[PDB]
Every structure is written in structure tokens, then in C-alpha cells.
Symmetry: C3
Subunit: 238 residues, 3 copies
């Protein structure tokens, strides 16, 4: 059982929506420390790891820890009913139901039924969210895959298509590149469709840390409310 209060329903809705683009259903582990969730998309190409610490909730009361399963598609619809200034209350008792209350000008309570990484990276780059998002959109216009190239103090994203091509270079002098630590020239390619969903909802000024290796998965992480952690693991493109 628990009672968790989050200020800013819209923000929470956004997070869930992002997750729903890849995940249809998932189990949320609710502990005294926070809420965590891990799952893979249907194609088993993306792994998503979310952690929301109790510190981002205006009230976090967990009587006894518990894991709950929910349909994200159904969950998002309800959460999208909340506004930016609305407070969201998540409550769970004995029954297999989740009580979702949107409190604003009035109190609206929904009742929804509940259902039942150690990689040797050789490159780490920290870029601004705006840059990452633009790069992914540019690439989608030319190809279905985007190549990541990381060299000493240099980060490049390229996409090659039938007859078109796009390239985004970045150096320490650039405002988009905050940090870069490369042990050796690193390159690999990933599916643009996946990255599109991943960079969905991503802020403009938020810092995104990307780690990857030659022909190996990419790890992407950024924070929500500075404390919440959203980590993605994306397999390379065959």
C-alpha cells in the first residue's frame, strides 16, 4: 500500500507517454526509496530503466513495498487528463486496483485495474538535448540508420541515404558538446526510429549522457526533475 503525490500532472503524463512509445505494459516497483521500472520493447532492441526517487514527490508514503503491473496505454490516457498545475495522487490499497486522483479546481478520481548492462564502453559524450533531437530528426529525412562517431575531442553523427546525406559535427568549442571522453576512435550505427521515440519529450537544455562502443549498444541517460533518472540501452543496427 502507498500514497504518492506528484506536483505537475502534465509532466508525469509526458514521462509515461514517452515510455509508452516503446513499452505497452510494465511492472513498477514501488519501494521506500522510490519507484523503479525496467523493460524491453517488443523488438527487444531497447531496454528502458527508469528510477524516480522519493525526492521528486511532494509526499511519498509507502506502508509496504509492492510491485504493480499496468497497461501504459491505458495509464497515459488518464494522466493526459491532468494539467500543468494539477497535483497527481497515486494510491494503492489491498485490491488489485490503482487509484489515480487529479486534483486541481476539483478532485477527480480514477480507478484502474492492475495486471500481472555491464558494457565496456570506449566513448562517453555529454550533449545538449536540443542538439540530439535535431540530429535525429535530420537523419530520419535521409536514412533509417544513424552512425555515431566519437574521436578525441570530436563527436559526429552521420546518416547516408539513397542519394542524400546529413552530417552533424561537434567539438568542445561547440555549445552543444559539454564533455567528451574517448579511449579510442569509436563508431557504430543505430536505428533512427528507436532514437526518435527515445528523444521524445527530451528537453532542450537538459544534459544527455551517451556512452557506446564499436558495434556495441549505446547507453543514453538524462534526468527528469534533476533527480529522476531515465536510462536507455539501444542495441546496434545489424
Amino acid at each position: 500500500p502507498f500514497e504518492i503525490v506528484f506536483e505537475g500532472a502534465k509532466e508525469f503524463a509526458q514521462l509515461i507517454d514517452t515510455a509508452s512509445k516503446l513499452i505497452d505494459e510494465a511492472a513498477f516497483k514501488v519501494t521506500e526509496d522510490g519507484i523503479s521500472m525496467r523493460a524491453m520493447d517488443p523488438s527487444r532492441v531497447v531496454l528502458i530503466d527508469l528510477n524516480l526517487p522519493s525526492s521528486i514527490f511532494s509526499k511519498y508514503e509507502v506502508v509496504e513495498p509492492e510491485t504493480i503491473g499496468v497497461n501504459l496505454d491505458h495509464l497515459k490516457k488518464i494522466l493526459k487528463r491532468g494539467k500543468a498545475k494539477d497535483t497527481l495522487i497515486l494510491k494503492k490499497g489491498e485490491e488489485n486496483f490503482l487509484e489515480i486522483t487529479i486534483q486541481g479546481t476539483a478532485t477527480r478520481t480514477f480507478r484502474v485495474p492492475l495486471i500481472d548492462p555491464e558494457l565496456p564502453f570506449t566513448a562517453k559524450v555529454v550533449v545538449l538535448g536540443e542538439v540530439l533531437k535535431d540530429a535525429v530528426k535530420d537523419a530520419s529525412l535521409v536514412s533509417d540508420s544513424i552512425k555515431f562517431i566519437a574521436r578525441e575531442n570530436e563527436f559526429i553523427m552521420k546518416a547516408e541515404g539513397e542519394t542524400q546525406e546529413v552530417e552533424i559535427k561537434l567539438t568542445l568549442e561547440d555549445e552543444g558538446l559539454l564533455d567528451i571522453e574517448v579511449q579510442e576512435e569509436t563508431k557504430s550505427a543505430y536505428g533512427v526510429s528507436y532514437l526518435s521515440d527515445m528523444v521524445k519529450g527530451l528537453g532542450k537544455a537538459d544534459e544527455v549522457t551517451i556512452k557506446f562502443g564499436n558495434e556495441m549498444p549505446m547507453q543514453m541517460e538524462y534526468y527528469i526533475r534533476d533527480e529522476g533518472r531515465l536510462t536507455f540501452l539501444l542495441a546496434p543496427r545489424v
Copy 2:
């Protein structure tokens, strides 16, 4: 014959649009006191009564009273051509045509051809438009019908679906509930689809008066420009 001037074309367009969601054609009675119109939707579940007093028009000149029939679908298209700061001029002479002039940066004149409740309520509630609108949208996500429950100083709207449920409670202490007069516990259910169209265009801060009774129709009314009156009569759901 007449010449009626309304300041704010967009506002008028909005009113007509709302009406067009339920009504396809209707007769407008134009008298020296104002413009009135009454009609039922195709399913005969909703009755709409509109009254626009001469006081909301910047100029209201009626030479001789007259009833005119018009296709609301055609009417709305033209009215939607007007902006928020545009002045609307409605003129009618001898012929079976309505002259609609949108006056803004230029004068644009359209010519369109013309075509040819005593209930024993036991509950009256006055709520803010924002509350009513949110409640209807919440409910549409779970069911096709919404239950209205009114008790002494307590108003509740519930919707029960396959496995989901939504509930919105309201008390005098709530900002959404402005007034409540109940003679005895009153309950009934109505179709959400109808209420959706009815609460369409409804303001956020405007006061809506709802009157109903056990398993009987609901009367809903609110004002336009504080003087204009829009009254709906909605049959209970079978």
C-alpha cells in the same frame, strides 16, 4: 426585415458551431426583443433553446418581426471566416436571402439562401464550467454514460465502465460548486456523447446551472455575453 450588428464575429461563430453539433437546420425567430431559436437534435434526446437579447448587439434594428430558416452547417462555415475583432452584420430584406457582412480591415458580404419543459426537478446545482467540462471528458474515457448524484450539499458525477471507473465529488467548500439546492437525494444517468457537444465552447469561469430529477431529464443553462441564454434539455439514458 432587419439589421443586426454583433461585435466579435468569432464569438458568434463559436455559438453557432456549438449549436451545429446537435442541430443541422433551425428557424431563428427575430423580434424586437431579440433572437430566439428552439429545436431538437436528430435523435430527439436534446432540446436546445437559445435566446439572444437585443442588449448584446451593438445595433439591433427590426423593422418587422420575422422567422428565418437556415442550414447551420453552411452558416458556420461563413461565420468562421470572421476574426475576434471583426464586426458581424446580419441583414435581411424582402427576398429569401440572408446578408452576412464581416467588417474588419475590409467589408466582405455573403449572401446565403434561406430555407423553410414543465418538469418537477428535485435538485439544482450551480457549478463552474471548467469542472463540468473536465468531468465530461474524464467520463468519456471510461463509459458512454455518466451518473449524476445530488444529495444535501453534495454533488457527484460517476462513470462506470468495463473495468475502469471515474468519480468527481463536490461540496460547498469546493470552488467548483457555487450553489446546491436539493429537496431529496436525486440520481439519473445521461449519454456522455451528448454532454460532450453540450459543454463544447463552454467557458471556464462561466456559471452553469443544472437542474434534474430521478430518472428524468436534465436542464442545463449558462449565459453568453452575460445576457444571452443557452438552455439545454437532455433526456435520461434508457
Copy 3:
């Protein structure tokens, strides 16, 4: 070869988009004086003449003049990736490729492959863009053709449909009419679908000069960045 820099990617994207509504592919003549392009739509009803002088570019370097052909549909997609504050760089070397760089928070470079009026008008009218645009939209609601009537100090646009009609009159006293020079009463009709695309992107306060004659083509022109010239020649409706 050349290197042309334009401040405000979005603005350029808009111009190209407008052109793409009528033209699918076209050759741009790049000279030391500026960039010009002339082409006809598929139905051969509209001729478009564009001239962008070097003065509207923040940097205009043309080593050797050159004509380049491009698919506007492909071009617009890429240009739409630019924001209002982005700088656009167009570069061409030896190969049959156009290098398009959007420079903002980061530098994104696209590589796209390159592919290979003396009328006796009797009426000239200068009207505000807002008026022209509203008039075209009003007319599209009633007919597929709009009639232009120009008399001494009087300009009228009419559209007659099955049973509806629209009319927009303009005099020197009107704010929408800036100037009018008529040698004799002039009238002709044009296709609304074409005018819709032509008035696409057209500003609200920009001055549009229209010249036409009895049952003859209409010439429409307005400026982009006060220096750029966009001229349309529209054949009368049969």
C-alpha cells in the same frame, strides 16, 4: 561555385514551400547579382518569377555563375528543419551536389543531389496582403472562380456559386486599397485554387500589386525582405 548565407532559415523555407505548391522542380540561376528562377505549374496556368538580390543575404559569394536544378519537394523538407533564428548556408562546388548547412546551436550539413510577359494591362491595384488572403478564402467557400472588377477608384472581387455569393468592395477611403490606376473598366475571372496557393505565406501588412486586363492574365507581385521579388502570372479562367 558559390557560398550564400541567409539569416533566418524558417523564412527561406517558407518561400520555397510556397513555390513548391505550384512547382515540383525548377532551375535556379545563381549570378553575381542574385538568384533568379522562372517556371510554370503543371497545368501551365501559372508562371512564377522569383528574384532574390544579393542584398538580402548576409554573405553572397559567387566565384562563377551557375544554373542548378533541384526538386523543390525534397528541398523544402530539409529547409523546414531550420528555425527562425537559424542561419542557412548554401554552398556549391564542382560536383552535382548542393550543400545545405543549418547553423544554430549546432552545425548540420545536408548534401542533396542536383538534377538537370508583355501584356497591355488596363488596371493596376495595390492592396494589403491581409485583404487579398481573406478575399480568396471567402470565395473558395462559394465558388471555384473569383471575378476581379476594377473601375475608377473602385476595386471589387466577386464569387458566385450554386446558391451562395460573396462580394468584397474596396475604395480609396478603405485601408485595404493603397492605390488604383484604371484606364477603363476591367474585368476577368481566375481559378480560386491557384490564387489560394499564390496567397500562401503572403504577409498581412505587405503590399501586393495586381495588374490585369479584360479576360486576360493577372500579374501579381509582392516583395520578400523588401528586396526579394516574387511575381506571378495567372491565366484567366476559361
